[PDB]
Design a protein around this nucleic acid. Structure first.
Ligand SMILES: [Au+]
Ligand SMILES: [Au+]
Ligand SMILES: [Au+]
Lengths: 128, 63, 120, 70
DNA sequence: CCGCAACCACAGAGTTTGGAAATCTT
DNA sequence: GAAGATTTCCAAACTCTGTGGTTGCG
């Protein structure tokens, strides 16, 4: 099954999730071989493809984000000095939406797990 | 040891060697694949026999 | 080899040695299994983090699902995971949308890997 | 590192290596030799099972007939 | 002091790749 | 009689795995 019996309870009680439910320092994890320069070029470049690879520095949890199936989108200009992202996801059978921003110069940001309710209800029904 | 003939004669051979090796290399890889193929066919016919065994066994019991 | 439950109820993956040497090829090939249905070709990648190490250097951590199973060709771990500490790996199955399975305290990566007790 | 081809350790090492290489290739030879043999070994096993499958089949069929034709 | 669990170096055998040098074939 | 193919001799650059030298922490 793509998901467990009930996402709700778990996401809200499950330590792992809660801890991530609340915004926290996140950093890009792309190529670390090339000096800062190439990286941002790569990240941004990857933003072009809708593919980013990040991880919650705090817990250490690594995650690969895909931007196309609130909403699954990527913003530029809300704040011109960084980038806003939203990514759909199913972390351990709990349909979720990953949101957060990264400073396109620092390659550092902060995101949160946002348990997509529509998707969770949808998956639960489609699942049997 | 530096003769004009050496500059050529030597590198001349090398070309033949490189080729010889590259040829023999492909001959081996191809042989390997050949093993994989036969292994596959073996594993099928194997399972296929165990099948017709129980299939004829169960048919011997119905008698 | 032996398979275990992931943090995601839809996937099972191989068990990794409790402890293992950096850049040393695993004892057994690492496999990710899908109970639900996953069309073949579907990519899978692992990554591993840690309160002390957030993104470890991995080798060949990208595999393609085939017949519901992800078979990795020499998955090697490179960054250490910190004394007494273990990594938590993230298996990411690339479908629409992507599914994620975590496997906490999965493996410990030291620079020496398991050694016979130094005889002194 | 930069070493002298006249030193001792260089020769000691350079020789021992040569020895290991003699063993290393002399080993690879036997693997290829065996791989080829396995080809014959398998080709034979397959033909042998083909006849076993072919035979075991004809038997199952002929056996069914007497069971349904009686 | 001792032993554990980590790090770092680094022998030392094994492999791989490729240019010599003998041999063999055709 | 010898050019090209096959085989044997070596060298040098890597990859693998184990043994020691050293440390902070019980
Ligand atoms: Au961008
Ligand atoms: Au946020
Ligand atoms: Au390493």
């Amino acid at each position: 099954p793509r998901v467990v019996p009930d996402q709700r309870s778990k996401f809200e009680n499950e330590e792992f999730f809660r801890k991530l439910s609340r915004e926290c320092e996140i950093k890009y994890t792309g190529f670390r071989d090339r000096p800062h320069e190439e990286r941002q070029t790569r990240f941004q470049n990857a933003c072009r493809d809708g593919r980013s690879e990040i991880a919650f520095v705090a817990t250490g949890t690594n995650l690969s984000l895909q931007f196309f199936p609130s909403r699954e989108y990527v913003d530029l200009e809300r704040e011109a000095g960084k980038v806003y992202l939203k990514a759909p996801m199913i972390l351990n059978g709990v349909c979720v939406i990953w949101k957060g921003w990264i400073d396109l110069h620092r390659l550092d940001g902060m995101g949160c797990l946002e348990f997509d309710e529509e998707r969770a209800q949808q998956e639960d029904a489609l699942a049997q | 040891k530096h003769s004009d003939e050496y500059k050529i004669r030597r590198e001349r051979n090398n070309i033949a060697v490189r080729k010889s090796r590259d040829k023999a290399k492909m001959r081996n890889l191809e042989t390997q694949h050949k093993v994989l193929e036969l292994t596959a066919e073996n594993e099928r016919l194997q399972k296929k026999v165990e099948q017709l065994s129980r299939e004829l066994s169960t048919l011997r019991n119905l008698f | 080899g032996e398979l275990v439950r992931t943090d995601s109820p839809n996937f099972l993956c191989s068990v990794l040695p409790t402890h293992w040497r950096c850049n040393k090829t695993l004892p057994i090939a690492f496999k990710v299994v899908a109970l639900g249905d996953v069309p073949d070709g579907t990519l899978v990648t692992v990554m591993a983090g840690n309160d002390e190490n957030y993104s470890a250097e991995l080798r060949n951590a990208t595999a393609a699902m085939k017949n519901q199973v992800a078979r990795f060709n020499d998955l090697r771990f490179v960054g250490r995971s910190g004394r007494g500490k273990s990594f938590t790996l993230t298996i990411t199955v690339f479908t629409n949308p992507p599914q994620v399975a975590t496997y906490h305290r999965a493996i410990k990566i030291t620079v020496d890997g398991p050694r016979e007790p130094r005889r002194h």
